[PDB]
Design a binder for this molecule. Sequence first.
Ligand SMILES: NC(=O)c1cccc([C@@H]2O[C@H](COP(=O)(O)OP(=O)(O)OC[C@H]3O[C@@H](n4cnc5c(N)ncnc54)[C@H](O)[C@@H]3O)[C@@H](O)[C@H]2O)c1
Lengths: 249, 257, 249, 257
Amino acid sequence: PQAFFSHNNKDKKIVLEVLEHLRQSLVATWIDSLIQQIIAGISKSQYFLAFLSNEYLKSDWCWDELEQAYALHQKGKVKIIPILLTNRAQLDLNALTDARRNFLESILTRLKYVEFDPHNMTRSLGSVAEALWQNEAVRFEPIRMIKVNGTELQVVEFKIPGSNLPVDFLHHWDLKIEDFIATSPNEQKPVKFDVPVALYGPGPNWLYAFLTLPFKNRNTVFVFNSRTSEYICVYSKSAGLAPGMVLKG
Amino acid sequence: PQAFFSHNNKDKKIVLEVLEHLRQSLVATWIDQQSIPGGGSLIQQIIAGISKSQYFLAFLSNEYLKSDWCWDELEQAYALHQKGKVKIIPILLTNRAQLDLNALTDARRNFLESILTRLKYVEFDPHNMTRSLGSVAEALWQNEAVRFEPIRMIKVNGTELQVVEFKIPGSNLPVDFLHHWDLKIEDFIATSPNEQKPVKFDVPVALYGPGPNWLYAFLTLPFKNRNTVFVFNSRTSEYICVYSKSAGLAPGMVLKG
Amino acid sequence: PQAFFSHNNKDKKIVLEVLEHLRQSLVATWIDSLIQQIIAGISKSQYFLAFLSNEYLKSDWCWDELEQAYALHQKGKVKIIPILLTNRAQLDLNALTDARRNFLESILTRLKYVEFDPHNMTRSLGSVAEALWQNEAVRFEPIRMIKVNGTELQVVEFKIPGSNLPVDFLHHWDLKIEDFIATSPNEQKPVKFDVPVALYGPGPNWLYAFLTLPFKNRNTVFVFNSRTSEYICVYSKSAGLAPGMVLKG
Amino acid sequence: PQAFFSHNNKDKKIVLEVLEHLRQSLVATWIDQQSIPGGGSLIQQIIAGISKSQYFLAFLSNEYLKSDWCWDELEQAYALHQKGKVKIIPILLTNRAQLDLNALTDARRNFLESILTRLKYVEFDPHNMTRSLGSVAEALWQNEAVRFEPIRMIKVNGTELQVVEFKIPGSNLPVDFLHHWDLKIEDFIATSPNEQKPVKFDVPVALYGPGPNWLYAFLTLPFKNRNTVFVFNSRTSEYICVYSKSAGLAPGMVLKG
RNA sequence: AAAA
RNA sequence: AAAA
Ligand SMILES: NC(=O)c1cccc([C@@H]2O[C@H](COP(=O)(O)OP(=O)(O)OC[C@H]3O[C@@H](n4cnc5c(N)ncnc54)[C@H](O)[C@@H]3O)[C@@H](O)[C@H]2O)c1
């Protein structure tokens, strides 16, 4: 589920670090156009992140990017999530013209925004990440590297919203995990290079097979079974680890 | 689950065709001279892999009983069988009633009678072939974990596909069963259309039957860049496409069965 | 039985903790729109919790949410439960306009409210939770974790109002228990992850089967039999516990 | 409640068809070398599971009584039966009047006569098949807990459904009976439409008969993601849907019987 | 069979 | 077969 970030360099500091958290959530993130890049892939294109801030509002040549993003949003192709670096109370609406203020007020009331602050970072990141997963199918929590039974491992946590997904959901899914696997240890990616990868959370068998298959010759695959609650090794790419061992959690 | 065939060329006709059915059941089959870098034969090839080595198929027949130099192969197979390394399944081409035990010496007859009563045998005949093949194949799966039925090529919704049917005996398997499993599916995938293998080359492969998620992942994973993988979901009972290696097939389509 | 919370951040402190008690009662709770989200599911949608307070009354842009909630409430789709953080005596009705005061007074007299205070918390929570269960079918008390015969277990207590339910009540029930099962020990949910779950209270056999079935491969299921009054184990997902043991209460 | 069948191929025709009726009664049936890895030989396969192992079905017949390779089968079955591990039910294909006892030796006749008088037998004939099958099936359920009638597929309100009828003998069962029950319903659910099993694949399954709530929950739970579950309520006497695995059926509908 |  |  791709993400396009529209922001100003005054907010550059918060943007990548916000994105870095979003990248670990198996989310495609694109920063450095964004207008004609909307028309790419399936109808579920991306969610526009409008990094709204006082300095962001003061650039007209940044404003027109919000127009075409919102103008085609009525077509249903893309949906926007406005991120408020500063609270709504002290947003400098006075400097905006009558057309600019009327446009901004309409999209802040009818369309839902997310408030962000540097202080309560953990809660702010969770609210930002979850809003990405509000209107989306099975979620994807950030990858956590945990050591179980002395073995280093990373967990790919995914939660299904509700209790079921469409039987043809895999057809319209725009998430392929080959793009999130690191090729070098120094290269930063959601999935660490050569580090064993584990899948956690309830789900259908085909969903587990769909995520496990692209990991052949890339990382060691671990599968969690809730019958007894230990991880199951299904792939042997690292030395000393055989397919079938259990990790007592 | 490997299989070693001991037989005579008078029964050669039934042996491969019996083996051909067993090969489609995802069973490793070894008759003459294959891929092991050991010393060949069937005696010292028993000591290879894990304690679950193989099941000796003694193709017992009247002409088979008449060769002494074929008899000693049954001795060393049975002599080390008491150690628990290998178990023998004697296949009777002819019924027990007309087995020529008289020509056998006192030691040979006493040895054969002991292993036919204590050890379990399977009767085979050319006439009732379908039932005979099922009895032979299932005896391979009697003392084994999750079974593997022969691969069947079925066309669903106009799409050619082969089904890998596996059934779990009981309702559970050990959580560490995958460690001691001696079945890796990379050796059963055909590389050329003319080459005969349990899994057809480039033909989409489907997994059928209830089982744990790790078992499905373990079987699906070695099929990357080899065949299109289909997974059966019992919630609504259609096959689910998870891999796209053939043109025109996307991961996520359903096959109404 | 879903619940939508309308409140101000001055009352934020009481809201989640009120909700946390309601979540343990197998109640769907939704906080962070609420207007167009009313039209979802069956006619038994939810009960609007109007967290009425003096600071809540002072926001006009919070008032219009109460209008559309009440305006469509006359259609019978949703019913509102107004929660008074402060007593009716000192509610600042004077600051409200003539239309606002007339609207509020009409809904406080004809429609029933619930009084809440921080001091008598246990009684206040019980009154709030029960008002959710007043116009509803078989109730659901908060989950209690009790240790019987040295075995950790949680009890799902449900009480049937009256002595019978409609034979087709399960068709229109909007409670599926798969959404209330925790997937991780750190994740907070009404049902603890991997902790054995027990069902308590008289009821029909199909109701017991309906609640027990979604727990396969999720939690160990215990059933209470009133013939001799010990819990009966029917599922074995945890080690050392076989289906058929009894817990002397 | 497992069942081991000892018979001769002259009575093969009646054996499976007798077993087929018994299989529909949620009874584990093992004729020869069945799934159970335990050496087919029903003898050492007796020592498996709980003290309530199985009931030996001695398919007694005139040609069976000439089967010396079979006379032994009974000895060890009866010899350990005195230990209380297994009980035998002798099935008389022919009536007691014309049983060829004369050909039997003095030891054989004395052994057979002792077990036919002190231990109870069941008479079977091809002619009155329905009554004979009922007598055979019920003798399996005589010394057993809550019974299990054969599964019947009935169409109620235009909906196809199968009923699992179970009757409790007496009016109560031990509170810890589920601990020692050797019946798990996962082994009786079909995985393919062509595969024959007590429970049809994807066909909704209904539970009928009075019983405790935990017994209903114990039987309903293993059916998740396997079949649609229906529960009968005697308050108003319609079936109640609790699981939705088939399209068009919601949990909560009623079937007017 | 509405804690049998 | 929706963590068996
Ligand atoms: N499954 C087989 O084909 C088979 C063949 C031979 C034997 C067996 C297994 O022998 C076990 C008993 O020890 P032992 O073999 O010493 O004696 P015994 O029981 O007298 O052997 C069977 C006699 O009957 C014929 N027959 C063939 N098929 C069957 C069959 N499915 N059920 C019954 N009888 C069968 C066979 O030719 C012989 O005359 C017992 O576990 C039995 O299943 C299975």
